[PDB]
Amino acid sequence: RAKAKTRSSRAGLQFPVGRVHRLLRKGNYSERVGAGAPVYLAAVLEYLTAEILELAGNAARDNKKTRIIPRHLQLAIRNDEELNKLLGRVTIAQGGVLPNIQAVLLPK
């Protein structure tokens, strides 16, 4: 009975591999689930989470705020071409819009 290790630590990840495995089994996605699928998926979710938080933290520093709020997430997403494509039809609650005024109407 060797000591209890977990898969997130073995894979070098923070996200929970085991829970993702259970969620795949439970949800009628496939009859069986391979060992590598939840590791790969967890890694992808971790990378994307880090990227969003990175940009929101940058936006947070521009506003001199130490805590991330939804506004900073909306600004991060809409200012990133690829995230905007991925989330082009998604509504971020309490996000607002980008300070974008069409140039021709702003004053002489």
Binding site: R89, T91, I101
Partner: protein, 82 residues
Amino acid sequence: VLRDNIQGITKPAIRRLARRGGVKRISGLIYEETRGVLKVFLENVIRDAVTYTEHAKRKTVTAMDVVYALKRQGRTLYGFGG
């Protein structure tokens, strides 16, 4: 109160929304059209939300019912669970 209805969605609130949309000047006839458009959107969403409600044999519409109704119309909403 003036219609017991959508007319409680006053002109200045619609103006504010147009301002957030970056609109500088607004014709007087826009307001009723917007109200109708809003009413249609709402009807479809509420219809689906209530349908989910009815399926569960529940008499309380939850936030999740709305999120799913919005999801099927391609207007996924984040921040209210799921």
